């Protein structure tokens with residue numbers, strides 16, 4: 001008796017099971033209400049019920065166990081967590097809790113937690129003694145997260161160009177700067193697919209705030225990982241809540257020496273949401289940005305770091321420029337002094353239908369020698385010195401024509417000499 | 418005895434009928450008052466009266482049935498809908514209701530609804546069980562909505578250029594960016610005529626907010642569809658109300674697997690109206706735009722989506738640029754990074770009296786391979802690569818001179834090779 005197991009079951013089988021259990025007509029009923037009635041009827045027989053979810057401690061002291069399939073939205077099937085157990089096990093926002101639950105009695109509206117069985121997918125004896133995320137020693141990117149497929153596919157050209165322009169390692173904090181209508185969607189899809197193919201052990205999390213739902217359901221059915229999104233039909237409060245829950249879960253996972261990867265596509269939208277939810281202080285800067293509005297996105301971005309004791313946190317955010325709004329322009333670069341990695345995309349190259357439209361000149365990675373060998377770094381330096389004199393479109397055409405001849409970049413580097 | 422039937426009748430015949438029924442002199446009376454008196458006299462004999470309209474639920478709990486011929490304006494002949502029936506049939510704003518009505522008794526001012534016969538042009542048993550619009554899975558444009566006439570007319574050149582620049586499919590969410598005095602009116606007229614000619618099965622709705630009455634009555638007598646407009650003589654409150662009613666009706670139609678097409682021509686004017694009706698919060702951004710003013714137009718724009726279960730919602734809004742106001746430059750923009758189709762028009766080409774004055778270079782459609790075949794996409798790519806080096810005016814002249822030689826674009830593509 002698990003909550004996620006009943007959530008994954010279809011509607012027809014749940015209706016059939018409820019009709020066999022002998023309850024009210026479930027055809028004219030919601031799936032969540034059907035599951036609730038089935039759990040009630042199964043607990044009336046004396047059997048136990050189990051559930052799971054991410055903890056969201058409220059300001060009063062209690063909390064609930066949000067579900068991932070609903071993008072951490074307030075649902076009727078949330079498991080109530082008393083503050084006594086929180087104080088007894090030192091629980092915090094983001095801790096994954098899995099234990100026995102019971103249906104609400106007369107006068108209650110949510111399931112109660114009796115005994116916790118597993119904390120953060122581990123024993124509670126290992127979670128009671130742990131080092132906080134704020135005390136971990138940061139470090140630079142040491143492990144190399146190669147994005148090249150290696151299967152010789154035609155779509156691998158984007159990953160090869162990305163590796164030649166800006167290699168990505170564990171704990172990297174980069175930025176994907178690109179004007180609208182440049183190809184950010186396809187680039188993010190390719191990055192997510194390459195991450196899921198090359199490094200399936202890492203925890204991939206794609207955050208899409210204030211996006212077109214069709215794109216949400218497309219990304220959810222395309223990438224092999226977790227997708228937490230919030231369409232534009234929701235207020236900025238839900239955006240802030242989702243961002244906080246995601247970053248808290250990422251911190252709790254990193255605290256257990258896990259490799260978390262966050263592919264953010266709405267850093268600008270997140271900053272707009274934070275500027276909308278912040279109370280007015282009577283002081284407005286140039287472009288309509290509050291003085292204390294960028295602090296929360298600043299911390300959300302700076303949360304990414306590489307841990308020496310174990311694990312890492314990678315955050316790749318895509319910033320929006322040339323959107324016609326001065327607020328986004330002020331945000332983007334305020335954040336430019338940030339992202340230890342900038343991958344610029346050119347609109348002029350995208351208009352020529354030359355995919356990918358990557359600005360190789362302005363791209364780059366700091367401390368790239370820690371992720372590449374000596375000969376590889378020398379070859380990349382020679383390639384950059386050869387590409388720099390040529391124009392952007394000409395350099396892109398040259399790179400595409402030279403990478404189409406071979407499958408691996410090593411052969412291209414060997415033929416360049 | 419139908420309301421719309423009496424509304425379509427002329428004034429002279431209604432006056433004659435009222436004089437034959439033996440009532441007060443109807444020559445010095447309004448047509449609506451004449452219809453009201455005729456309905457009263459016909460109901461005094463014991464016969465039944467029927468009406469219809471779009472439901473507009475008020476904040477208190479009751480509602481009225483607005484009429485389409487009055488642009489959903491508050492009229493004396495609105496049918497009152499009690500909240501009891503709303504609670505009994507789960508009615509919402511936008512549901513088309515058609516049932517028996519009765520004249521108001523002593524102390525009443527509006528017609529009452531006794532029994533509902535048809536809901537959303539369908540049986541109530543099919544409307545009681547339905548999936549909300551917020552739960553439908555979005556998708557990209559799959560079905561091709563070809564705009565080419567095919568009759569070899571001289572006006573078909575605009576549709577041919579539009580198809581070669583940006584093909585339109587079901588569920589598309591585009592933008593027509595053009596400075597003033599460019600030819601937006603003729604272009605919108607041609608688009609509406611091509612939609613009514615090629616795809617007469619789709620529900621066409623043209624929304625004109627804050628425009629001149631002459632243009633309104635011109636569009637109403639030119640296109641073959643529904644025209645809901647609101648001239649500048651009305652406050653922004655009526656603009657917001659009309660936009661809400663139109664989008665709610667569109668959502669209710671899409672919920673019944675219908676293909677709705679909305680040709681918006683005032684996205685900038687709608688954003689200005691929303692910025693005017695929003696209460697001041699003491700925080701003004703660059704250009705005079707409120708922080709929470711663009712949220713409602715953002716949702717109105719993002720409502721457009723393609724449904725996998727059935728139906729679609731297409732919204733083609735025309736944004737205004739270079740109007741001398743910085744608010745529109747932020748308002749029209751901020752919207753640039755939202756849609757997935759931009760059809761730019763050049764003022765320099767319009768000054769040369771070269772119609773249509775379309776910027777073929779900056780135009781385009783994302784995921785265009787889902788609406789065109791392989792050979793068609795290759796021919797469009799070759800045409801774009803040939804047109805790109807030439808200047809805007811030169812490319813437009815070349816395209817016009819090459820399309821004037823033949824009737825179909827297939828012959829042009831075959832002759833280009």
Ligand SMILES: Nc1ncnc2c1ncn2[C@@H]1O[C@H](COP(=O)(O)OP(=O)(O)O)[C@@H](O)[C@H]1O
Pocket residue numbers: 158178179180181182183184185186187355356782783784785
């Ligand atoms: N690698 C690519 N190959 C082919 N087309 C692409 C590629 N990247 C982008 N595009 C085109 O650009 C359009 C928009 O790209 P997108 O990633 O949505 O840009 P952004 O996210 O910056 O708005 C897509 O619909 C696609 O047709």
Ligand SMILES: Nc1ncnc2c1ncn2[C@@H]1O[C@H](COP(=O)(O)OP(=O)(O)O)[C@@H](O)[C@H]1O
Pocket residue numbers: 575595596597598599600601602603604772773
């Ligand atoms: N396809 C066309 N053919 C001929 N003239 C046109 C065409 N499109 C626009 N025009 C001219 O431009 C004028 C204004 O066009 P309009 O569509 O009103 O531009 P906008 O809507 O951008 O203000 C029209 O009065 C018309 O004379």
Ligand code: BEF
Pocket residue numbers: 179180181182184185320753754755756
């Ligand atoms: F319009 Be893109 F997604 F920035």
Ligand code: BEF
Pocket residue numbers: 596597598599601602737
């Ligand atoms: F003056 Be146009 F209608 F933008």
Ligand SMILES: [Mg+2]
Pocket residue numbers: 184185
């Ligand atoms: Mg995008």
Ligand SMILES: [Mg+2]
Pocket residue numbers: 601602
């Ligand atoms: Mg116009």
